[PDB]
């Protein structure tokens, strides 16, 4: 029972609207942005999400604009978009029909931490690797996600496919043009953001991804606190006080403020023992005060921490093959093509 | 019962060192900031908190410098302070010996919320009123708390006395001298701070207070969100999109950015019906974009929503007299000395 039928434009096709029918409409997500539905497509029977936001008629919807440009194994796909609403309002809503994926890194991590246990490092490698691809991809367009966190990392429990989602904060950054600093979420904000910088770069996403990796290793977020001050105290307990040369590289307006004069904690006893050394080493190269020093998503994918993934004989724990991982396009590799010699091993060419 | 004796300077007295004896010492809180213990003073039995924090070898601790100036019934008193050791060390620690108060607005709001019930209006008026005095007092030394939130509002659940505590974020603001923008926590941050202003005024505390009142009336936070954007979105749903001039008074760097074009929700529809109209009115004068448009703490105390408190026959639900509400000092009234004629009603003069 109850089939909904709407007139939608495909996400990447040509702008030519078709009838699209779907059932099993249920609310799965609600909040500020608007509402997210689950439904099943009547044709091929496939599961999809429906992000429904209010449309500003002034000019285009940034998120729609970005989703239509993107096509990537590790990013949720925009299948259709369409407009709506017929009950009692008189505003126009945009609805984005997206690929559906049932689990999130946020959930998996919560299951492990609650059960006082650690995610096997193979999953950590798998998930973080695909994240870096997704970022290397979007960054190559100049798009910055600006809200990297465990709730926006989607997972296939059986195939270990991670797909990045929620582009409702994404922005194409232009060098010299101001950006709002108040984006990005509670545990995952780069110090330049905590400092109110309006000229950050994409390296805010690498910082965040470091917070997720560190979290998956620790079983809890590495820099907690309900405020900037509190978060910064955590950051400093681990990184030490930023030098003046680092403060100015984050936000020059902040060089004269009093900071807790705390010395650098050795990165090793941040994590418990038998945490892989390559995992720690990678964290330290992501979570650097000076934005320009953080690794790039592409350089991260090539870090020795992901070597296991490159061994021909790697299998998933459940015995299946690992998901696609070496199918790099030129776009994906544009930032630094000579990396391909590490990124794509002898066996899959 | 292990007794402990230290040498300690009284909080605001003459600067003469004194032997202080305490027992029943126990940890009641951790721990980003440091530690907080509860103890009992020996010769008076009074219970105290002992906030212990790392003390910067290099210059004077700001919190101490602030606490030493304050003497107010709606603010937690610094009784003594002393330096000591703690966990390694090197490192020296400062120990602030403070009035103990067992409950917090944050825990009380929560009790009623869990039990699908609203806090009785009388208690709201009382808690909000006392917070408004605490802020008039501190603001008159030019001191801004910078972290007003339900969990920093201590309550004697029995007598209804509210005391402001946690000065770890407090600073004395000076015009033309910039301030870090990342103070003040989730749910309670004025929009100038979400915009990362460095030249805000004490009126950020008043915004935060607006958020406390609204939260108490709604049974949950008015502006929630795990990010500035979400928060902002919540603010805008209610106040509507800020104008070019409203933005410019919050943070002139932000006046040209794209903001969701949404008109205000009526204040009338934000709160459940039955919410007293004076409460809605008061909020509407606290949660304003233009920081200078907000009520000063002293104006808020004088607002009609507090008239019941100036009733001569008013009593707490449990049948007890109201706590001290009218003992204003020259310091406390110094922003608008006139207003005294509304604030101390006929019965409290004579
Ligand atoms: C800001 O909007 C968003 C935030 C985060 C994710 C999403 C989201 C997406 C999905 C969801 C998958 N699960 C398991 C969800 C669970 C919820 I709750 C949800 F809202 C969406 C999804 C999904 O499978 N594909 C999505 O694009 C669409 O808007 C989101
Ligand atoms: C960060 O500093 C602070 C944050 C919040 C309050 C406080 C705090 C204080 C008390 C506490 C009363 N309760 C009921 C508490 C409960 C806890 I947990 C606690 F830590 C202190 C107290 C108190 O009774 N007097 C205080 O000065 C001292 O540092 C704090």
């Amino acid at each position: 029972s109850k089939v909904t039928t709407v007139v939608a434009t495909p996400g990447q096709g040509p702008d030519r609207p078709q009838e699209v029918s779907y059932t099993d409409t249920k609310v799965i997500g609600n909040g500020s942005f608007g509402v997210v539905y689950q439904a099943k497509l009547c044709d091929s029977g496939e599961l999809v999400a429906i992000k429904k936001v209010l449309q500003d008629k002034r000019f285009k919807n940034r998120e729609l604009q970005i989703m239509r440009k993107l096509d990537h194994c590790n990013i949720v796909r925009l299948r259709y978009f369409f407009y709506s609403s017929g009950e009692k309002k008189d505003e126009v809503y945009l609805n984005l029909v997206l690929d559906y994926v049932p689990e999130t890194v946020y959930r998996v991590a919560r299951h492990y931490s609650r059960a006082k246990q650690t995610l096997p490092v193979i999953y950590v490698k798998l998930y973080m690797y695909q994240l870096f691809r997704s970022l290397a991809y979007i960054h190559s367009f100049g798009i910055c996600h600006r809200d990297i966190k465990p709730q926006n990392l989607l997972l296939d429990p059986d195939t270990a496919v991670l797909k990045l989602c929620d582009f409702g904060s994404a922005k194409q950054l232009v060098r010299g043009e101001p950006n709002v600093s108040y984006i990005c979420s509670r545990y995952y904000r780069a110090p330049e953001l905590i400092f109110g910088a309006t000229d950050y770069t994409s390296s805010i996403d690498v910082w965040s991804a470091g917070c997720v990796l560190a979290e998956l290793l620790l079983g809890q977020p590495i820099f907690p606190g309900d405020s900037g001050v509190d978060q910064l105290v955590e950051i400093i307990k681990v990184l030490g006080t930023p030098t003046r040369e680092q403060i100015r590289e984050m936000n020059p307006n902040y060089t004269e403020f009093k900071f807790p004069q705390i010395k650098a904690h050795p990165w090793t006893k941040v994590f418990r023992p038998r945490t892989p050394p390559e995992a720690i080493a990678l964290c330290s190269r992501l979570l650097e005060y000076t934005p320009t020093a953080r690794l790039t998503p592409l350089e991260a994918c090539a870090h020795s921490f992901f070597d296991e993934l490159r061994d021909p004989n790697v299998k998933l724990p459940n015995g299946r093959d690992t998901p696609a991982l070496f199918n790099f396009t030129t776009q994906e590799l544009s930032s630094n093509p000579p990396l391909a010699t590490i990124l794509i091993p002898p066996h899959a060419r």
Side-chain angles (χ1 to χ4, degrees), chain A residues 1-86 89-349:
Chain A
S1 79
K2 55 265 299 318
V3 176
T4 331
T5 296
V6 293
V7 181
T9 301
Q12 28 286 156
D15 202 326
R16 175 188 48 232
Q18 345 157 168
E19 259 139 312
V20 173
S21 314
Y22 63 84
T23 28
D24 296 357
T25 321
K26 61 221 288 281
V27 168
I28 68 156
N30 177 289
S32 270
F33 56 95
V35 193
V36 188
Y37 304 87
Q38 205 210 45
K40 178 182 187 176
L41 288 181
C42 292
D43 281 0
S44 63
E46 294 193 325
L47 293 170
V48 286
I50 303 169
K51 198 179 195 249
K52 176 174 179 156
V53 301
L54 198 84
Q55 179 62 99
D56 172 61
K57 201 188 78 206
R58 192 178 39 179
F59 263 1
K60 307 192 156 265
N61 183 283
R62 191 173 294 171
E63 187 184 3
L64 182 52
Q65 209 179 188
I66 281 153
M67 294 267 83
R68 306 190 63 175
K69 303 194 297 220
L70 307 173
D71 183 46
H72 195 91
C73 42
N74 301 300
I75 287 172
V76 80
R77 196 160 65 84
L78 174 68
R79 300 161 154 275
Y80 310 96
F81 63 102
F82 65 86
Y83 297 91
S84 70
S85 254
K89 212 75 109 301
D90 286 290
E91 274 286 340
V92 196
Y93 296 84
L94 157 80
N95 318 60
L96 325 163
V97 182
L98 302 137
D99 277 348
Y100 173 77
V101 182
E103 277 297 334
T104 75
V105 171
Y106 180 76
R107 264 159 80 202
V108 169
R110 181 180 73 176
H111 281 345
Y112 273 85
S113 79
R114 146 175 288 92
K116 250 295 196 280
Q117 193 90 42
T118 7
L119 186 61
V121 168
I122 189 54
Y123 295 120
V124 183
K125 289 169 191 175
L126 280 162
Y127 300 150
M128 290 309 306
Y129 181 82
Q130 296 176 80
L131 184 43
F132 287 117
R133 269 192 101 179
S134 76
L135 302 172
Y137 183 69
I138 59 152
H139 290 186
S140 65
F141 282 94
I143 291 145
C144 174
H145 181 281
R146 312 201 298 172
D147 208 354
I148 300 305
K149 60 186 192 214
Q151 301 105 104
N152 298 343
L153 304 186
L154 306 162
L155 304 178
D156 181 302
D158 301 328
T159 76
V161 166
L162 178 146
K163 278 174 158 260
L164 175 66
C165 75
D166 189 14
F167 286 73
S169 289
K171 217 277 195 87
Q172 181 153 318
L173 301 191
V174 172
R175 171 86 37 172
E177 279 163 8
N179 310 304
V180 301
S181 64
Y182 55 64
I183 35 79
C184 208
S185 297
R186 193 146 125 272
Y187 307 136
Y188 307 92
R189 319 183 71 219
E192 62 270 43
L193 301 178
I194 300 174
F195 283 174
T198 52
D199 71 350
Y200 46 85
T201 64
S202 290
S203 61
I204 68 157
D205 286 341
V206 170
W207 173 276
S208 303
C211 302
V212 173
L213 167 64
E215 187 158 340
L216 293 171
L217 300 174
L218 279 167
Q220 82 203 193
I222 183 169
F223 306 131
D226 306 319
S227 52
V229 226
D230 290 354
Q231 285 152 41
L232 225 222
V233 163
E234 303 304 318
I235 301 192
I236 291 167
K237 286 196 184 177
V238 180
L239 295 183
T241 308
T243 63
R244 211 173 179 273
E245 163 79 5
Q246 289 165 309
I247 292 151
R248 94 181 342 127
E249 204 57 334
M250 294 189 288
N251 182 345
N253 294 289
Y254 274 60
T255 58
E256 310 299 277
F257 291 130
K258 294 176 199 293
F259 293 112
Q261 302 299 290
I262 303 173
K263 74 209 178 66
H265 198 230
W267 260 119
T268 304
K269 223 228 213 70
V270 160
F271 309 107
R272 43 213 206 207
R274 296 185 188 188
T275 299
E278 307 91 9
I280 302 177
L282 182 57
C283 269
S284 81
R285 291 266 66 259
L286 298 167
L287 296 182
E288 290 270 7
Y289 284 132
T290 291
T292 55
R294 293 162 207 173
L295 294 185
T296 68
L298 210 58
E299 289 158 323
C301 295
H303 191 267
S304 56
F305 179 60
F306 301 114
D307 286 357
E308 176 167 21
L309 306 183
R310 283 181 283 261
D311 172 73
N313 301 277
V314 64
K315 289 282 158 293
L316 295 183
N318 73 15
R320 303 178 197 197
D321 300 1
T322 40
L325 299 171
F326 311 119
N327 49 334
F328 285 97
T329 66
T330 298
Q331 175 75 329
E332 227 164 335
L333 287 151
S334 61
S335 70
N336 185 179
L339 282 198
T341 85
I342 321 162
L343 281 171
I344 304 176
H347 75 284
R349 288 178 159 152

